[PDB]
Amino acid sequence: PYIADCPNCGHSRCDSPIAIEEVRGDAHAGVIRIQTSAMFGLKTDGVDLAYMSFMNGKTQKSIKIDNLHVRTSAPCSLVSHHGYYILAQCPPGDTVTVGFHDGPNRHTCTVAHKVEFRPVGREKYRHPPEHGVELPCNRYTHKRADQGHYVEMHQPGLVADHSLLSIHSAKVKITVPSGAQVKYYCKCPDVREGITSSDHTTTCTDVKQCRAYLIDNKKWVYNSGRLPRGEGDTFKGKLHVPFVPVKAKCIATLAPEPLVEHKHRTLILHLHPDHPTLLTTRSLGSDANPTRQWIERPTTVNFTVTGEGLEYTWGNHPPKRVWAQ
Amino acid sequence: RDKGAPLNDVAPFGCSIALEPLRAENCAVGSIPISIDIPDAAFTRISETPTVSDLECKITECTYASDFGGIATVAYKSSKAGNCPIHSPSGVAVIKENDVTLAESGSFTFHFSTANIHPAFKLQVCTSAVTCKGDCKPPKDHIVDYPAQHTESFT
Numbered sequence A: 001p002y003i004a005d006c007p008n009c010g011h012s013r014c015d016s017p018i019a020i021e022e023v024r025g026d027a028h029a030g031v032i033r034i035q036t037s038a039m040f041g042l043k044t045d046g047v048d049l050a051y052m053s054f055m056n057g058k059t060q061k062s063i064k065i066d067n068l069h070v071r072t073s074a075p076c077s078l079v080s081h082h083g084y085y086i087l088a089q090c091p092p093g094d095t096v097t098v099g100f101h102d103g104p105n106r107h108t109c110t111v112a113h114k115v116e117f118r119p120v121g122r123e124k125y126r127h128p129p130e131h132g133v134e135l136p137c138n139r140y141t142h143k144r145a146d147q148g149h150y151v152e153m154h155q156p157g158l159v160a161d162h163s164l165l166s167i168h169s170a171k172v173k174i175t176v177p178s179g180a181q182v183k184y185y186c187k188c189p190d191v192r193e194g195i196t197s198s199d200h201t202t203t204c205t206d207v208k209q210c211r212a213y214l215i216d217n218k219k220w221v222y223n224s225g226r227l228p229r230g231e232g233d234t235f236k237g238k239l240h241v242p243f244v245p246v247k248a249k250c251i252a253t254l255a256p257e258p259l260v261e262h263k264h265r266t267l268i269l270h271l272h273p274d275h276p277t278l279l280t281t282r283s284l285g286s287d288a289n290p291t292r293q294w295i296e297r298p299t300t301v302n303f304t305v306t307g308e309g310l311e312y313t314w315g316n317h318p319p320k321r322v323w324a325q
Numbered sequence B: 001r002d003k004g005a006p007l008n009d010v011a012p013f014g015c016s017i018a019l020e021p022l023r024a025e026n027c028a029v030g031s032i033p034i035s036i037d038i039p040d041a042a043f044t045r046i047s048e049t050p051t052v053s054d055l056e057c058k059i060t061e062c063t064y065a066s067d068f069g070g071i072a073t074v075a076y077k078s079s080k081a082g083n084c085p086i087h088s089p090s091g092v093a094v095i096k097e098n099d100v101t102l103a104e105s106g107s108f109t110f111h112f113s114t115a116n117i118h119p120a121f122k123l124q125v126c127t128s129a130v131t132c133k134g135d136c137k138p139p140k141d142h143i144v145d146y147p148a149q150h151t152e153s154f155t
Helices: none
Strands: A020-024 A031-036 A051-056 A059-064 A069-071 A077-082 A085-089 A093-099 A108-115 A134-136 A150-152 A238-240 A249-251 A259-263 A266-271 A277-281 A291-295 A299-304 A310-312 A320-322 B056-063 B070-075 B082-085 B099-102 B110-113
Touching: A020 A093, A020 A108, A031 A093, A277 A310, A291 A299
Parallel strands: none
Antiparallel strands: A020 A031, A031 A085, A051 A059, A069 A093, A077 A085, A093 A108, A134 A249, A150 A238, A259 A266, A266 A299, A277 A291, A310 A320, B056 B070, B070 B110, B082 B099
8 A cells, every 4th residue: 555645635745645646537427536545455465355455654554444535526426446546436526535534533635636527418417317318428347357457566665764763872773664675874974775674873863864764665556656766676566457447338418308399491499408408400401501509598599491401419319300391 | 628519410411420430321412323233033024014004193182292292093094903013204203102003994092292383293104104283282290300202393
């Protein structure tokens, strides 16, 4: 579970494990795929997707997911998590605002991202309905058995941990997690690399002038922009994405039927939608003479139909056609 | 969201579209010089269909319209009895019936549609021409899909 710098972490820029990168309000189904720097899913070892492992300290905390909250302008709905990554059904929102509850603390993370949800169709809803026609939307999956893409996930760079740099009663005293690789020296001249167990520091004294580092590359990370490079190498760790964008047919929009009214080679149409509906036509002469107008306000319109025919498209309701001799 | 409109909503001369082989379906424009070689076996020899001449044709309720509202009885005067393919070689009249059954010199109405108030169209009832002259009436109810008439000219 990677940890990075959340931008407006409740107060201001903290370093949250759930630091939000790559917000994708690019689908249609009320859904956003998000990456936390935290890797929830199974535990550290082997069990139960519905548990929760973020970083506390240098360490993980692979425990229950109890009170996740993604949210935006309104509280979102989770869809599924896998890896670093969560899918959640959100409404539109100027921002994105994520957070669980460990239990002692709220411990959330928030971010800017322009979000919208147009459904696919000539109706510009704000939200998916219960009914209407199905038609080919873009949307992310529920599932994990997924390989359609993979993002590079090589090592972490080092990280700071000044909990290490204690004092040896006059000298600044570094320690190690588990024998991990601590990269160490101070502004003064003393040990210059640091690949060690718990060292002391002969020369410097102040904690604030030393290299508290953790080369702990036993587990790779996501290659966040808010990661410091592991300077050594491009290690392996090519790793999939679960939530591929797929060609789901969203349960989708439908605009109320029109009121057809006859006139001489002319369609008066008293019209009354639910939401802004893009109407348009095609006078089937080799003179096309089409028309487009989003209609949200109910409006009686007109169409000079010709002899050979016109067609009529009340939103994603199917196209009509008309003989006006 | 600041795009232009689609060609299946702005094209001319009547087309539909697919992200499929990139066709533009059903583009109604112009003419096509079409020519067929029928199987001669499918022909019936002339001496087996009834000769229908010494007949008479007349409209009874001609509808000056698109749907096949035009009708006309025909005083069929046959020799044998059987089928008799029909057509108006003039494009004025478009007929719903390709073929009419015949007893020994009966009468059978067909359906059609025209565009000229005085439809003076020949009717070729299996090698027997006839003018089905008359007069037609305008309809009232014009909001449904596309016509069968497609023969508008000077009238």
